[PDB]
Design an enzyme around this catalytic site. Structure first.
Site, mmCIF file in Angstrom:
data_model
loop_
_atom_site.group_PDB
_atom_site.id
_atom_site.type_symbol
_atom_site.label_atom_id
_atom_site.label_comp_id
_atom_site.label_asym_id
_atom_site.label_seq_id
_atom_site.Cartn_x
_atom_site.Cartn_y
_atom_site.Cartn_z
ATOM 1 N N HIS A 462 0.839 -1.222 0.000
ATOM 2 C CA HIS A 462 0.000 0.000 0.000
ATOM 3 C C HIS A 462 0.864 1.257 0.000
ATOM 4 C CE1 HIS A 462 -3.964 1.789 0.451
ATOM 5 N NE2 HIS A 462 -3.418 2.649 1.331
HETATM 6 C C1 LIG Z 1 4.514 8.968 6.995
HETATM 7 C C2 LIG Z 1 3.974 7.561 7.026
HETATM 8 C C3 LIG Z 1 3.951 6.816 5.872
HETATM 9 C C4 LIG Z 1 3.441 5.507 5.847
HETATM 10 N N1 LIG Z 1 3.436 4.840 4.652
HETATM 11 C C5 LIG Z 1 2.933 3.631 4.637
HETATM 12 C C6 LIG Z 1 2.888 2.930 3.418
HETATM 13 O O1 LIG Z 1 3.299 3.408 2.370
HETATM 14 N N2 LIG Z 1 2.332 1.674 3.420
HETATM 15 C C7 LIG Z 1 1.856 1.095 4.545
HETATM 16 O O2 LIG Z 1 1.392 -0.045 4.430
HETATM 17 N N3 LIG Z 1 1.904 1.725 5.743
HETATM 18 C C8 LIG Z 1 2.406 2.942 5.787
HETATM 19 N N4 LIG Z 1 2.455 3.626 6.985
HETATM 20 C C9 LIG Z 1 1.949 2.962 8.197
HETATM 21 C C10 LIG Z 1 0.460 3.053 8.307
HETATM 22 O O3 LIG Z 1 0.093 4.428 8.276
HETATM 23 C C11 LIG Z 1 0.023 2.372 9.604
HETATM 24 O O4 LIG Z 1 0.745 1.157 9.731
HETATM 25 C C12 LIG Z 1 -1.464 2.037 9.702
HETATM 26 O O5 LIG Z 1 -2.234 3.240 9.732
HETATM 27 C C13 LIG Z 1 -1.774 1.219 10.930
HETATM 28 O O6 LIG Z 1 -3.204 1.069 11.076
HETATM 29 P P1 LIG Z 1 -3.823 1.138 12.547
HETATM 30 O O7 LIG Z 1 -5.302 1.025 12.414
HETATM 31 O O8 LIG Z 1 -3.084 0.164 13.401
HETATM 32 O O9 LIG Z 1 -3.426 2.621 13.004
HETATM 33 P P2 LIG Z 1 -4.046 4.054 12.647
HETATM 34 O O10 LIG Z 1 -4.499 4.075 11.222
HETATM 35 O O11 LIG Z 1 -3.072 5.092 13.095
HETATM 36 O O12 LIG Z 1 -5.329 4.093 13.608
HETATM 37 C C14 LIG Z 1 -5.254 4.844 14.853
HETATM 38 C C15 LIG Z 1 -6.420 5.794 14.962
HETATM 39 O O13 LIG Z 1 -6.865 5.801 16.341
HETATM 40 C C16 LIG Z 1 -7.021 7.122 16.799
HETATM 41 N N5 LIG Z 1 -6.794 7.145 18.249
HETATM 42 C C17 LIG Z 1 -5.595 7.159 18.927
HETATM 43 N N6 LIG Z 1 -5.754 7.174 20.232
HETATM 44 C C18 LIG Z 1 -7.132 7.173 20.423
HETATM 45 C C19 LIG Z 1 -7.940 7.188 21.578
HETATM 46 N N7 LIG Z 1 -7.471 7.209 22.820
HETATM 47 N N8 LIG Z 1 -9.280 7.183 21.396
HETATM 48 C C20 LIG Z 1 -9.762 7.158 20.146
HETATM 49 N N9 LIG Z 1 -9.105 7.146 18.992
HETATM 50 C C21 LIG Z 1 -7.778 7.154 19.203
HETATM 51 C C22 LIG Z 1 -6.045 7.956 15.982
HETATM 52 O O14 LIG Z 1 -6.455 9.309 16.005
HETATM 53 C C23 LIG Z 1 -6.145 7.264 14.616
HETATM 54 O O15 LIG Z 1 -7.222 7.775 13.844
HETATM 55 C C24 LIG Z 1 2.957 4.929 7.042
HETATM 56 C C25 LIG Z 1 3.004 5.690 8.224
HETATM 57 C C26 LIG Z 1 3.483 6.989 8.229
HETATM 58 C C27 LIG Z 1 3.494 7.775 9.517
#
Ligand SMILES: Cc1cc2nc3c(=O)[nH]c(=O)nc-3n(C[C@H](O)[C@H](O)[C@H](O)COP(=O)(O)OP(=O)(O)OC[C@H]3O[C@@H](n4cnc5c(N)ncnc54)[C@H](O)[C@@H]3O)c2cc1C
Ligand SMILES: Cc1cc2nc3c(=O)[nH]c(=O)nc-3n(C[C@H](O)[C@H](O)[C@H](O)COP(=O)(O)OP(=O)(O)OC[C@H]3O[C@@H](n4cnc5c(N)ncnc54)[C@H](O)[C@@H]3O)c2cc1C
Ligand SMILES: C[n+]1nn(-c2ccc(-c3nc(CCc4ccccc4)cs3)c(OCCC3CCNCC3)c2)cc1CCCCN
Ligand SMILES: C[n+]1nn(-c2ccc(-c3nc(CCc4ccccc4)cs3)c(OCCC3CCNCC3)c2)cc1CCCCN
Lengths: 489, 489
Positions: A462
């Protein structure tokens, strides 16, 4: 036990011939003679040392497709905030041709290095012709009463003379150019007519479009209904639309009846529907037939048939047991990596001891259109004939980056064709940027007999265009007993 | 048998959370509550509905990488004969940010459409926190004595709050920006320092380089020896060189000791070696740790450990049997399509009946550097520990089109890692344009347990960068008992 001057004579230093020639000479220490008509590219013969692919095919064609994308990419840049002068922007075609020639010419030079340096491998410039199954003659010209330069006493003969563009044969045929003459044009044409619906017509449509000097235009004109016969039918329709929005006017059910010259040197062109029109240059990409027609084949007793095609068994062998033929002269799949394989497997068969035929089923193919196509395996049309029950997976999205660039016509499209029974992947059909890179890896999977299971069990990369292969779970529709059905019985 | 207000409460509307939330609600008709801190992107919270990936990760990052290539592609165009004004050429960063925000904002809007329209699926804006294993609380602020907006009585809890950028912790930490603040910068910085050696540092190095206003420059500065730890070692060295020739100065064994403010608002930066220097903006990409640190986890009895990581079994389950956790909060593979899978397989486990864990081995990865990297499976380093006898295939060529464009630094590089025994493909490591597209298809092959046999038995697509996968037959060198050898015993 040395009886003959050469173990192998190769007619044509093409993709097929050079692979066969080189392998025989270095890996099996045979004495090889390779015949071609000239040593560096260019008129009036065009093909040369390295073959059609290197001199007037794939390699130059791609260099010039890469050129014509810069048009679409300099437009795209504005949305991402590249301010710059869009009055002072037309492409200089002379700088493209000069750069392309420097490259093709370097490859021709690097092949003479290969001959002088490689042992038992000699190059014989002239026109190949059989006398008997063990003698090949080299003339100055293809005229059979030309001065004879060499008589090559040999054991095996490999015919790999490739193919040549078909002419239209109407009053005005000799005014039109071809894939050959297009590469050495002096000026990029203001008003261009590309006759034909084959991949070459469409690649060259995109080039002449990219390099039109200002108020110029390109008309593609195909004698049928829908361009690129025996490609996926929704991919063809999607390209026809996208050519439309890149500037190319496509016309169909349309055939030139006549071309007269004009005063300023442009071409008057009379069509089916009555219509006449003037074009600067007019190009014929209407199929390419084998070059058997001057090898005196009938003299040494080798089998001809469909349009000069050299009639050959699976292991590349003609009706004469010591004569073999590979590549486009045979008229199987007319691609370069196919001929390379057929020739590599000719050397393994004959000299190597380890006999092998070439695999022609599920070979990955690509069109360097703008935008490009990748395809591997069969259309849904020829699936639903040869298979009881067929699933068709299909997905069409627009990368978000085009909501910035302005290029909203650029739909990326994937289609997967399935055997319902076991879920085996029979075909894959992609359109859009990077499709030729993606299909090469898909071609590996379908060789290992990949099921749709294997695609959508794979963690994605992705963000990518290719990640949409692994997100295709529900079939769009099916064929049972080769009739299209909304849903399965 | 309705006992609780909600079947499922999801902390974090991220890649992981939304997949879990949505599936539970539509495919198993559960009543789901999704908690996030804000509904559209932007400071001071950055993350929002759609998660890190959509608002401040993959999606914006790629839009802005695509921008910064236009620099390298407008240079490249000149060789193909695109004459145009190369004085009037600097990029407007405000037009890029505006365009990027229009896009991210459209995705945030398309997610509120999803909630209002989808039944049993509600969105709860605020700050998630556990009271017990069946109650989640939503506050105004993360300060635990904030006004409480909702008390979500529920059966299952899914923690998917993701991760947050690590700070340096030195005198001057609060002057440096992060991946978060970089996206909402007002001006593209004249003199930029990217601290770190991780993929984010290197992607953002390429962006700031692409969008430097005229006489500007970018310094990457990494505290180790060779950037991108646990990528192939020859791919890292090749990128380090190519960043060099795109303009990025890379420094190593170098760590900021101190940042003071300056007069005109630039940043004075003191280093290891004594050196001081002024930079307009200074960015920390030095690793991202889990957001457990404000969920009152200890209160409801769920297992923490390595940097706040939620300690979890293979099926995503915490030390409390009704509480689950997926994505970056768990600290396994920190990619988006991984979390999506972990969440999809959480819903199948719990609600679906069909229990399943996520596959973490041979997941295809990509860096949107300039030029980009695709990688899948293991380095030759960790191969030669876990396998008796290892073959390393390797091939490095320069597309001919770069002999025209002038970009002769752009080497395309493939490496394949093998188990000598059976020829199984353990790893693949590519560098150069289109590598992220190509690896997605390779990731499918290595899931089906592809042998090096299967690569070089596949007819090529000519001409392509990917066709060099199927032309790799001789290993470059081997490892037996994890020691590098010229040739095999
Ligand atoms: C600059 C950058 C580039 C990236 N590029 C890639 C890429 O090219 N390909 C790839 O596969 N991955 C990439 N990633 C990684 C990817 O963004 C994450 O691995 C992915 O979003 C993880 O999904 P998640 O649901 O675990 O976390 P997230 O999508 O971060 O879900 C967390 C959510 O929970 C919310 N939250 C936090 N604390 C609380 C709380 N106490 N109460 C309620 N809500 C809360 C946050 O506001 C956020 O909306 C990248 C990351 C960054 C920073
Ligand atoms: C515009 C264009 C684009 C193409 N693009 C692609 C592509 O992208 N990918 C792809 O895979 N394929 C492509 N092809 C097809 C590819 O060029 C051919 O399939 C390939 O060259 C076939 O190899 P061959 O050895 O059979 O023929 P050739 O390479 O044509 O070998 C024939 C050689 O024999 C010589 N010869 C002919 N007659 C004689 C004689 N009597 N004596 C001695 N020498 C003789 C010719 O001068 C020539 O050098 C393209 C073709 C064209 C025209
Ligand atoms: C002395 N010597 N010279 N050469 C030798 C010398 C040259 C080439 C080539 N050059 C190009 C031009 C590409 C280009 C490069 C740079 C810029 C523009 C174009 C293609 S291929 C070559 O081809 C080996 C594979 C083959 C070739 C035939 N097709 C099949 C594969 C062998 C090799 C040797 C050692 C052999 C010892 C003799 N027993
Ligand atoms: C009424 N209704 N609305 N929606 C509905 C509405 C919207 C979305 C999305 N929108 C985007 C924005 C992308 C974009 C598009 C165009 C321009 C910019 C950005 C991503 S996803 C959606 O997601 C389905 C897959 C999921 C989603 C959650 N992650 C998992 C996959 C469902 C769907 C329904 C029918 C459902 C019936 C209710 N029982």
């Amino acid at each position: 036990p040395m009886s003959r001057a050469y173990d192998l004579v190769v007619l044509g230093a093409g993709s097929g011939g050079l692979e066969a020639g080189w392998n025989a000479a270095v890996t099996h220490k045979k004495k090889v003679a390779v015949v071609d008509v000239q040593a560096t590219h260019g008129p009036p013969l065009f093909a040369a040392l390295g073959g059609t692919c290197v001199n007037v095919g794939c390699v130059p064609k791609k260099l010039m497709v890469t050129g014509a994308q810069y048009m679409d990419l300099i437009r795209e840049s504005g949305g991402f905030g590249w301010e710059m002068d869009r009055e002072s922007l037309c492409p200089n075609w002379k700088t493209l041709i000069a750069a392309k020639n420097k490259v093709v010419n370097s490859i021709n030079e690097s092949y003479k290095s290969m001959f002088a340096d490689t042992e038992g491998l000699s190059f014989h410039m002239g026109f190949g012709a059989l006398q008997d199954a063990h003698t090949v003659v080299v003339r100055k010209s293809e005229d059979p009463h030309s001065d004879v330069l060499e008589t090559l006493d040999t054991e095996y003969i490999l015919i790999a003379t490739g193919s040549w563009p078909t002419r239209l044969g109407v009053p005005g045929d000799e005014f039109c150019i071809t894939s050959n003459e297009a590469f050495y044009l002096e000026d990029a044409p203001k008003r261009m007519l590309c006759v034909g619906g084959g991949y070459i017509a469409v690649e060259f449509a995109g080039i002449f479009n990219g390099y039109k000097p200002c108020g110029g235009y390109v008309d593609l004109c195909y004698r049928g209904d829908l361009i690129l016969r025996g490609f996926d039918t929704e991919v063809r329709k999607s390209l026809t639309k996208q050519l439309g929005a890149n500037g190319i006017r496509v016309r169909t059910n349309l055939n030139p009846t006549k071309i007269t010259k004009n005063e300023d040197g442009s071409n008057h062109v009379h069509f089916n529907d009555g219509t006449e029109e003037d074009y600067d240059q007019v190009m014929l990409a209407i199929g390419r037939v084998p070059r058997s027609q001057a090898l005196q084949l009938d003299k040494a007793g080798v089998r001809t048939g469909k349009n000069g095609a050299v009639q050959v068994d699976a292991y590349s062998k003609t009706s004469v047991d010591n004569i073999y033929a590979i590549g486009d002269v045979t008229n199987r799949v007319m691609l370069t990596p196919v001929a390379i394989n057929e020739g590599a497997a000719f050397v393994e068969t004959v000299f190597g001891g380890k006999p092998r035929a070439t695999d022609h089923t599920k070979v990955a193919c690509a069109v360097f259109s703008i935008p490009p196509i990748g395809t591997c395996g069969m259309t849904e049309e020829e699936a639903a004939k040869n298979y009881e029950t067929v699933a068709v997976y299909a997905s069409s999205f627009t990368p978000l980056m085009h909501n910035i660039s302005g290029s909203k016509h650029k739909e990326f499209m994937i289609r997967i064709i399935t055997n319902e029974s076991n879920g085996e992947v029979l075909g894959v059909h992609m359109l859009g940027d990077s499709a030729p890179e993606i299909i090469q890896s898909v071609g590996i999977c379908m060789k290992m007999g990949a099921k749709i299971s294997d695609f959508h069990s794979t963690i994605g990369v992705h963000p990518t265009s290719a990640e949409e292969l692994c997100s295709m779970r529900t079939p769009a529709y099916f064929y049972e007993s080769g009739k299209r059905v909304e849903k399965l019985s």
